[PDB]
């Protein structure tokens, strides 16, 4: 039911924007970056991975991957809605510059929207494919 969001350019896996808060990130972060690497033009546009008490959820659009982690318990239904909101906003705002940048996190400032939107999904009072992540990796 918790957080971990990363947006990365599919081709090389160049990190575009992320968001994390702890008070480990370490492990699941590697996996996330493992996935980005593997993801290509032949990969599923919308998939769900199972990694124990955890569950990865992602979508891809215009060569950009929106990945999210959280306790499996979290609504898979709510997970993608969360990603969709990010997409449109992001594509609308930076969709056309993505294929030109080369620095890691050249959109850290997308940090704000991610978190203001992240909260609208992690509070019950405000209201595809599945594979063991261990595989794809």
Partner 1 sequence: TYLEFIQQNEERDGVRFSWNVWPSSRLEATRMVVPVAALFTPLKERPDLPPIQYEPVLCSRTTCRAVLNPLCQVDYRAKLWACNFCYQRNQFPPSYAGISELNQPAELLPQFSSIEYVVLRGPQMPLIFLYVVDTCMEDEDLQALKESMQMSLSLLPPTALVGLITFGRMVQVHELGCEGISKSYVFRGTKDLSAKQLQEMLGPPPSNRFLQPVQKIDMNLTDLLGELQRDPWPVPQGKRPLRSSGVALSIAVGLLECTFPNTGARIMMFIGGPATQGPGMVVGDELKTPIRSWHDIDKDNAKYVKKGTKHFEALANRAATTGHVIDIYACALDQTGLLEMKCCPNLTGGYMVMGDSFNTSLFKQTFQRVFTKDMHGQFKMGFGGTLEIKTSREIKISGAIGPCVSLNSKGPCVSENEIGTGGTCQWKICGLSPTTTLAIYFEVVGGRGAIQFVTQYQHSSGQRRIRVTTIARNWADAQTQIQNIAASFDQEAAAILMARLAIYRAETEDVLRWLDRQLIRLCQKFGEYHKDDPSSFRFSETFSLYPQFMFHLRRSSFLQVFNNSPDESSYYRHHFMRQDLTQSLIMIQPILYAYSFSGPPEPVLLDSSSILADRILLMDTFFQILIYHGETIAQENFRHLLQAPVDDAQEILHSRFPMPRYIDTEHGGSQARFLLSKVNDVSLQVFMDHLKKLAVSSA
Partner 2 sequence: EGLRVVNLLQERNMLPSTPLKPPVPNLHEDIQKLNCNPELFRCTLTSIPQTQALLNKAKLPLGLLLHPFKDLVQLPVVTSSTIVRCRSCRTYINPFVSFLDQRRWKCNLCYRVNDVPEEFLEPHRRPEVQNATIEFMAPSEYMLRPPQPPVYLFVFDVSHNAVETGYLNSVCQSLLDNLDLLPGNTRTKIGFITFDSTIHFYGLQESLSQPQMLIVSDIEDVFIPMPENLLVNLNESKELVQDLLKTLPQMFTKTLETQSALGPALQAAFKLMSPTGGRMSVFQTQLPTLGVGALKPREEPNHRSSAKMTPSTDFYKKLALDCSGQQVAVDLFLLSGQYSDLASLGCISRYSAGSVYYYPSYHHQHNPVQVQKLQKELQRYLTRKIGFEAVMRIRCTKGLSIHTFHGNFFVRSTDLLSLPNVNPDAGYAVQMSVEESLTDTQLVSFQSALLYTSSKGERRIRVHTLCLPVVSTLNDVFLGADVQAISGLLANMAVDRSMTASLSDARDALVNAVIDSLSAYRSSVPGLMVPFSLRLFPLFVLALLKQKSFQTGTNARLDERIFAMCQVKNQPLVYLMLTTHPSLYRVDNLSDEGALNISDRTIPQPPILQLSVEKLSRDGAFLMDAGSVLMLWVGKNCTQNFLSQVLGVQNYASIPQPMTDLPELDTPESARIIAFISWLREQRPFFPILYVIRDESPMKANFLQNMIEDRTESALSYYEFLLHIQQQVNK
| 19 touching partner 2, by CB under 8 A | yes
Which is it for the CA torsion 33, 135, 38, 111, positive or negative?
negative
Residue 83: in which H helix or E strand, if any? helix 76-94
CB of 17 to partner 2, least distance (A): 8
Residue 38: partners with Cβ closer than 8 Å, 6 or more residues away: 136, 137
How far apart are the C-alpha atoms of 134 and 51, rounded to whole Å? Answer: 7
Candidate residues 50, 85, 91, 111; the one interacting with partner 2 per rule CB under 8 A: 111
Candidate residues 40, 100, 102, 124; the one interacting with partner 1 per rule CB under 8 A: 124
Task: Rank residues 72 and 122 by Cβ distance to partner 2 and give the closer one.
Answer: 122
How far apart are the C-alpha atoms of 137 and 134, rounded to whole Å? Answer: 5
| 25 touching partner 1, by CB under 8 A | no
Interface residue list for partner 2 (CB under 8 A): 14-15, 17-23, 25-26, 29, 102-105, 108-109, 111-112
């Amino acid at each position: 039911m918790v957080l971990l969001t990363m947006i990365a350019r599919v081709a090389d896996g160049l990190p575009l924007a992320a968001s994390m808060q702890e008070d480990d990130l370490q492990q699941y972060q590697s996996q996330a970056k493992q996935l980005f690497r593997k993801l290509n033009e032949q990969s599923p546009t919308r998939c769900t991975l199972e990694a124990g008490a955890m569950t990865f959820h992602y979508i891809i659009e215009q060569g950009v991957c929106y990945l999210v982690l959280c306790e499996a318990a979290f609504p898979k239904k709510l997970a993608f809605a969360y990603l969709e909101d990010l997409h449109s906003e992001f594509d609308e705002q930076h969709g056309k510059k993505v294929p030109t940048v080369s620095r890691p996190y050249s959109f850290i400032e997308f940090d704000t929207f991610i978190q203001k939107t992240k909260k609208l999904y992690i509070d019950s009072r405000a209201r595809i494919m599945v594979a063991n992540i261990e595989e794809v990796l």
